[PDB]
Amino acid sequence: QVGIGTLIVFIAMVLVAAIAAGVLINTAGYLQSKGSATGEEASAQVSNRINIVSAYGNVXXXXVDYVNLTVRQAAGADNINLXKSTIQWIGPDXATTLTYXXXXXXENFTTXSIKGXXXXVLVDQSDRIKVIMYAXXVXXXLXXGXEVQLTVTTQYGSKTTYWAQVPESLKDKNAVXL
């Protein structure tokens, strides 16, 4: 008679094992997608960085009105999107964060393609894109020897900072190099 009872408990442990078995696999399924994505973005956090080749600027009257930075992919950088990037401005007067706009809209920035196909995305290593920012709209133009702190923040998080240094004298200079 004992054998009959064994079968039901036999079955009960069968599902109980499956219930116990399943949760680990579905859990491991959660981390395996979760961990893999974590490695990619963290790698993109350190690798997908932006490097400024140079930063010139047009000069009107006696004050810098434009600060154009020619940005470039860093070592091993993937397709960097500039439309999903922000620039933090730290100046003598104002101190805001600039987002991307189209065709400079004061508290924003605009990108023109110096070299390449796209005008908002760095695809290959050789493309250079110039980010236009109205210095005569985010602040009262730019005085001589004025110090601007730019922190170009990529989408993933790689922050490249820049110390903009206006020349101490702008005596008859059509365009300077900050």
Ligand X SMILES: *[C@@H]1O[C@H](CO)[C@@H](O[C@@H]2O[C@H](C(=O)O)[C@@H](O[C@@H]3O[C@@H](C(=O)O)[C@@H](O)[C@H](OS(=O)(=O)O)[C@H]3O)[C@H](O)[C@H]2O)[C@H](O)[C@H]1O
Does residue 88 belong to the site contacting its own copies (CB under 8 A)? Answer: yes
Map the footprint of its own copies across residues 22-81, applying CB under 8 A: 53-54, 56, 58, 70
Instruction: Give the count of residues interacting with ligand X (CB under 6 A).
Output: 15
- Shortest reach from residue 104's CB to ligand X, in Å: 9
Q: Which of 53, 75, 78 is nearest to 152 (CA)?
A: 53
- Comparing CB distances to its own copies, the nearer of 44 and 131 is 131
State the number of CA atoms in the 13 A half-sphere of 140 facing the CB: 4
Residue 102 CA: distances (Å) to CA of 37, 81, 105, 107, 119: 31, 14, 8, 12, 11
* Of positions 94, 106, 140, 144, contacts its own copies by CB under 8 A: 94
Does residue 92 belong to the site contacting its own copies (CB under 8 A)? Answer: yes
- Comparing CB distances to its own copies, the nearer of 21 and 95 is 95
Q: What is the DSSP letter of 34?
A: H
* Of positions 12, 124, 144, 161, contacts ligand X by CB under 6 A: 144
Q: How far apart are CA 104 and CA 12, in angstroms?
A: 70
